[PDB]
């Protein structure tokens, strides 16, 4: 008897279920979806092809990367889900993101990134900074070559907030997404002022006065629908002309 | 220097600076393991690196690092040091240190304790000297209690009066009194200040010798009763009663009086049973009459100079005596070999009170070791820090020669070829002293600096020929920089057409005068026309080396380019003095006449805080007048300590910034007048 088949089935079921039924349920009471549900909503039905699903640091490595099609046009996506486990943008997470951008820039298709740092340990090893630097280098390299879109769907903190800023467009979800480099507690420790997380880095702050985000949407489903509608506007690469659609 | 003789294996040098380096050097040169103590700040100094092993002894202050009796004792304990060498100062003349060292088997390299408390106090030293049939300054033995007693003593000891605080030292508590009212008020104020300075609260009144010469005799004695006198030393150039320039042989003295003084010093040493190297200081008047004044029961600071004439290593002799070996030299063996002159290079500004201590970090430091007959004793290296905790002396420079003139010329050359960038030194004062006419002739007293510079030090007053040479050198350097600016690499796309200007016509502003200069270049040779005078300057024109050697009309000169700006400002160290010049082209000079003078002095009586923060330490006290570039306080802000400097020379009215008080940007720190 060979255990390879049962091991593969167990690995696939663990990757799909992620951290278990309790973790997805807890994600659901917060009014937010999971990485795979967001990918399924964003892409065309039955068009998602995942990459490096068996790469470990625990399968999945808290990021789901792959390629899909929106209205028949190719796109490359990655989605972050750190609530299940991991809590570190250091190991195979950064490598998977870098590889998916490398494929996108080779083929010449846009990159869409669903950023959700969630519960991530910002006190992990030095590999996180190296991965961040590699991701920043790839965003700078791809700038002006292929479009890059960022959708912040959760609390993003630390040095990871520079990758969305280097992309062409940045969108947020109201009441569930944040962008800030330094947490409110450290701000109180240093500056000595009482500030809450929502008014320090919420969607309203970054869409009304900060000038960092471009638009804010009501919830995840609305955000993904508007993301598809907006993606229908752009060309796939700087080598292509502005898209032309049927007109009435 | 024979290693066959058995000697102490481990010696601990309980000192810092150049003396520790010298002791370590002479111990290494005879094959002895060395241990050096240091504080936290001096963890990377020269003496710590020269030693075989080192141990930290405490914090920055000397009261808790180099005077921490226990810490040194356990430092000896761990390293099982067989001997201890205190150098000079610190614990060199401490009786408790000698007793505590004698408690263990470790031996103290220095004079016996009994001599230390015999010569520590001035009154008992004078009484013993009078019992030792040696000449003493006229005066009244005993301690005067009241000003009326002081004036009664002054009635018979002569109209001049010298008041001196008992014990202590370092040029403190010594004052001159002329009149009876002067006598009484000086006595009262000295009695008041004795508690603050030393706490001994004992005073002495003596006859003040007018125009005295502070001669010094070095004495070496062993434990077998053999005492030798090694020539003499002259220590006359002093400010704040501190020696600056010393000469090994005394040009005033002759063989007979030198022998008399040496015999008297040896007799005094025998009367105390001295068993190490010491010094006896005399005040010789104009009539070749010497009177004893103080005996330093330790190694002298100016000891190396008398090592040059005699050729003896004093520290080696002290080590051998401590080992117990007898002296290997006799009185007839001692003889004078040439002349030797040395100077103390301090980190002080010579333009203020003949020297005011300065602080900073040395960005550049180079010694003229390659010059002939030059020896440098320095505990300083590039990147060293001159703090407020220790003596700000940088180095001791020694030059020897066949005669006095050769030594003085070598000293001038060494001072010219000695690089210090980062702090303010007193090299200009040293050079002016050594080239002064009176010093060369040999007529010097203890008031040389006072009467030679009544108002104060102003710099080198340069003559017409020297002024022309300086202007020619500055103009040639400016033209050399301009010519170097035009040397680019080949572009092969836009070739550079070098301008063919033949004569540079320049306006040079020096002090408050403007001179017209015409400079022409002929390769490495510049022809300079300064107001009709024709000069010829040749040099290698290396614009990057700190030292530049030029030849003006055959005369060899060494200059330094301290500063250089695109606006024409230039700072040139020439003949030991830093001169500021402003060089412009003729067209630029003509167009500069239309530039309105801009007033920027303002008032600045209020020092607004540059950055927001919370004051946590205060270095100074309110009401203490300070000059520019001096520490004020330490502010903590975002886990960072920031230290600022005083803004204006004005007297500090009140230090508003204090510990526990938050001071944001734009708030008064220190009130100034």
């Amino acid at each position: 008897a060979t255990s390879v088949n049962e091991r593969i089935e167990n690995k696939r079921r663990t990757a799909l279920l992620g951290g278990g039924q309790r973790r997805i349920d807890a994600q659901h009471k917060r009014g937010k979806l999971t990485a795979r549900e967001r990918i399924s909503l964003l892409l065309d039905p039955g068009s998602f092809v995942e990459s490096d699903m068996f790469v470990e640091h625990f399968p999945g490595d808290s990021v789901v990367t792959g390629r899909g099609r929106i209205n028949g046009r190719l796109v490359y996506v990655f989605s972050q889900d750190f609530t299940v486990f991991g809590g570190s943008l250091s190991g195979a997470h950064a490598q998977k993101i870098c590889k998916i951008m490398d494929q996108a820039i080779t083929v010449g298709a846009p990159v869409i990134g669903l950023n959700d740092s969630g519960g991530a340990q910002i006190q992990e090893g030095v590999e996180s900074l190296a991965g961040y630097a590699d991701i920043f280098l790839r965003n700078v390299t791809a700038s002006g070559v292929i479009p890059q879109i960022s959708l912040i769907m959760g609390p993003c903190a630390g040095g990871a907030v520079y990758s969305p800023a280097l992309t062409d467009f940045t969108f947020m979800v109201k009441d569930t997404s944040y962008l800030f480099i330094t947490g409110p507690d450290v701000v109180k420790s240093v500056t000595n002022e009482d500030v809450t997380q929502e008014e320090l880095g919420g969607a309203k702050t970054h869409t009304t006065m900060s000038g960092v985000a471009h638009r804010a949407f009501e919830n995840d489903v609305d955000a993904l629908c508007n993301l598809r509608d907006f993606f229908n506007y752009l060309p796939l690469s700087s080598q292509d002309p502005a898209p032309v659609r049927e007109c009435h | 220097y024979d290693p066959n003789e058995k000697t102490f294996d481990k010696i601990l040098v309980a000192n810092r600076g150049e003396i520790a380096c010298r002791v370590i050097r002479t111990c290494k040169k005879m094959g002895i393991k060395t241990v050096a103590i240091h504080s936290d700040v001096d963890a990377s100094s020269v003496h710590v690196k020269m030693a075989d092993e080192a141990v930290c002894v405490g914090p920055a202050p000397t009261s808790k690092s180099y005077l921490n009796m226990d810490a040194i004792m356990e430092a000896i304990k761990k390293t099982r040091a067989q001997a201890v060498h205190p150098g000079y100062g610190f614990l060199s003349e401490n009786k408790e240190f000698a007793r505590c060292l004698a408690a263990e088997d470790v031996v103290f390299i220095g004079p016996d304790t009994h001599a230390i408390q015999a010569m520590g106090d001035k009154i008992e030293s004078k009484l013993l000297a009078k019992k030792a049939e040696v000449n003493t300054i006229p005066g009244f033995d005993g301690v005067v209690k009241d000003a009326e007693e002081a004036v009664r003593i002054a009635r018979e000891i002569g109209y001049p009066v010298m008041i001196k605080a008992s014990a202590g030292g370092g040029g403190k508590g010594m004052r001159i009194a002329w009149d009876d009212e002067e006598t009484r008020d000086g006595f009262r104020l000295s009695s008041q200040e004795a508690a603050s300075s030393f706490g001994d609260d004992r005073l002495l009144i003596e006859k003040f010798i007018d125009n005295p010469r502070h001669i010094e005799i070095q004495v070496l004695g062993d434990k077998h009763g053999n005492a030798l006198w090694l020539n003499e030393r002259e220590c006359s150039i002093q400010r704040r009663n501190q020696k600056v320039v010393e000469e090994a042989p005394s040009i005033f003295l002759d063989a007979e009086t030198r022998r008399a003084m040496g015999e008297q010093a040896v007799a005094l040493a025998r009367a105390v049973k001295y068993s190490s190297a010491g010094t006896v200081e005399f005040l010789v008047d104009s009539k070749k009459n010497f009177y004893f004044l103080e005996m330093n029961t330790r190694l002298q600071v100016e000891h190396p100079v008398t090592e040059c004439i005699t050729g003896l290593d004093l520290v080696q002799e002290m080590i051998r005596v401590a080992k117990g070996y007898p002296l290997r030299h006799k009185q007839a063996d001692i003889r004078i070999n040439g002349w030797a002159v040395e100077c103390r290079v301090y980190a002080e500004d010579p333009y203020k009170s003949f020297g005011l201590p300065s602080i900073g970090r040395l960005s550049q430091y180079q010694e003229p070791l390659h010059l002939p007959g030059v020896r440098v004793d320095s505990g300083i290296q590039p990147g060293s820090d001159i703090s407020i905790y220790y003596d700000p002396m940088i180095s001791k420079l020694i030059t020897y020669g066949s005669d006095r003139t050769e030594a003085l010329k070598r000293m001038a050359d060494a001072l010219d070829n000695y690089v210090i960038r980062g702090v303010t030194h007193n090299i200009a004062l040293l050079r002016e002293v050594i080239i002064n006419s009176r010093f060369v002739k040999g007529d010097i007293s203890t008031k040389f600096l006072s009467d030679v510079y009544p108002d104060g030090f102003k710099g080198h007053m340069l003559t017409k020929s020297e002024k022309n040479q300086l202007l020619a050198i500055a103009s040639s350097l400016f033209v050399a920089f301009q010519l170097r600016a035009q040397h680019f690499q080949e572009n092969s796309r836009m070739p550079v057409i070098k301008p063919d200007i033949a004569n540079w016509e320049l306006s040079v502003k020096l002090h408050d005068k403007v001179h017209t200069v015409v400079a022409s270049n002929n390769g490495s040779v510049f022809s300079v026309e300064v107001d009709g005078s024709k000069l010829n300057v040749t040099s290698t024109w290396n614009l990057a080396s700190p030292l530049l050697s030029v030849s003006v009309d055959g005369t060899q000169r060494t200059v330094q380019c301290l500063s250089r700006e695109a606006g024409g400002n230039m700072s040139i160290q020439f003949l030991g003095t830093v001169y500021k010049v402003n060089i412009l082209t003729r067209l630029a000079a003509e167009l500069n006449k239309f530039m309105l003078e801009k007033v920027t002095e303002d008032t600045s009586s209020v020092l607004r805080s540059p950055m927001p923060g919370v004051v946590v330490a205060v270095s100074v006290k309110p009401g203490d007048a300070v000059a520019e570039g001096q520490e004020i306080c330490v502010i903590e802000a975002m886990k960072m300590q920031n230290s600022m400097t005083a803004g204006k020379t004005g007297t500090v009215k009140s230090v508003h910034c204090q510990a526990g008080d938050t001071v944001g940007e734009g708030d008064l720190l220190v009130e100034l007048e």
Partner: protein
């Protein structure tokens, strides 16, 4: 000015305790030719230093942190001041030398409301886009993503060095060895050899050519 001149003054310039500051202009003056340095914006955003100097006669652009001012923390003004200088130096084939002592980004609500993210991204882009030779020396500190900002090895930094007092970590592993074992720094050099090392690197990297995908122009986070 010889290219192999030693600078022993830099051995003890960095205080041992991290709570004290020092002047980076002293290091810059010690390293460059003839101790001559043309500073740009000397009185604006004083927590960062940018300027022009010469090494072995070749013009170089210099960027560094200033621990004296605001502990060297990066903010909006310093980021914008540095980014445009780096972009100009890259556009005209001028090599870049960086001295890194950054403890992070300045926290507060004013920085967030002013868009610290955009200007930090400007600095990241300026350092990552440059194709001229760049040499980085870490003096004391590099914390968090700020270490990524100032031309880490992963931003195509050609040669990176660390002094024995350098300390690279995510948050405030108190030595540069985690960086050395992972190749984040090429070597740990003595402070006195710095200038010499840099000169040698500038001799090697003068023929550096890189290849990047075609585009009309990229999208700076302006």
């Amino acid at each position: 000015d010889p290219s192999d001149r030693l600078v022993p003054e830099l051995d003890t310039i960095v205080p041992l305790e991290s709570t004290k500051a020092y002047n980076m202009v002293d290091i810059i003056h010690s390293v460059v030719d003839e101790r001559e340095f043309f500073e740009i914006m000397p009185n604006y955003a004083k927590n960062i230093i940018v300027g022009f100097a010469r090494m072995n006669g070749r013009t170089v652009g210099i960027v560094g942190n200033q621990p004296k001012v605001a502990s060297g923390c990066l903010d909006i003004n310093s980021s914008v001041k540095g980014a445009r200088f780096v972009r100009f130096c890259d556009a005209f084939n001028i090599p870049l030398i960086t001295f890194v002592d950054v403890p992070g980004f300045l926290p507060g609500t004013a920085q967030e409301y002013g868009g610290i993210i955009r200007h930090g991204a400007k600095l990241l882009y300026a350092f990552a886009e440059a194709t001229v030779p760049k040499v980085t020396v870490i003096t004391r500190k590099a914390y968090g993503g700020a270490y990524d900002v100032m031309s880490s090895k992963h931003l195509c930094g050609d040669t990176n060095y660390a002094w024995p007092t350098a300390e690279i970590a995510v948050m405030g592993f108190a030595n540069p060895f985690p960086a050395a074992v992972r190749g984040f720094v090429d070597d740990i050099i003595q402070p006195s050899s710095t200038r010499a090392r840099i000169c040698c690197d500038l001799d090697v990297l003068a023929s550096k050519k890189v290849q990047r995908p075609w585009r009309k122009h990229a999208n700076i986070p302006l």
